[PDB]
């Protein structure tokens, strides 16, 4: 299942409600093509990996999340688990989400 974070309040709550499954966040931009261009993958994994939690963040309308995460390049994939960070990587690499997810799965 996916989860949209419109405020830092929903950010921490997303990790808390995420249970203990892996959690990948997509810091993209709905107005930016190159960022949303990777949605047919990250968001698609929602059906191929129903055992993984996927989040979404608007680096422009939710600058509070990007601010605390100091994001300077989109899309930025960040991995969280039980509210703790384990790894992260930016750069359009949808195939990497698979290898990274299967890594900390």
């Amino acid at each position: 299942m996916v989860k949209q974070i419109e405020s830092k309040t929903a950010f921490q709550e997303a990790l808390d409600a995420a249970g203990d499954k892996l959690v990948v966040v997509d810091f993209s931009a709905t107005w930016c093509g190159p960022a949303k261009m990777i949605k047919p993958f990250f968001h698609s994994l929602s059906e191929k990996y129903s055992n993984v939690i996927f989040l979404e963040v608007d680096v422009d309308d939710a600058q509070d999340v990007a601010s605390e995460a100091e994001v300077k390049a989109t899309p930025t994939f960040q991995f969280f688990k039980k509210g703790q960070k384990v790894g992260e990587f930016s750069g359009a690499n949808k195939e990497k989400l698979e290898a990274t997810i299967n890594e900390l799965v």
Partner: peptide, 13 residues
Amino acid sequence: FRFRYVCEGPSHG
């Protein structure tokens, strides 16, 4: 509007 920094999606290389 909603603009911030560069989107290095399939734009980088």
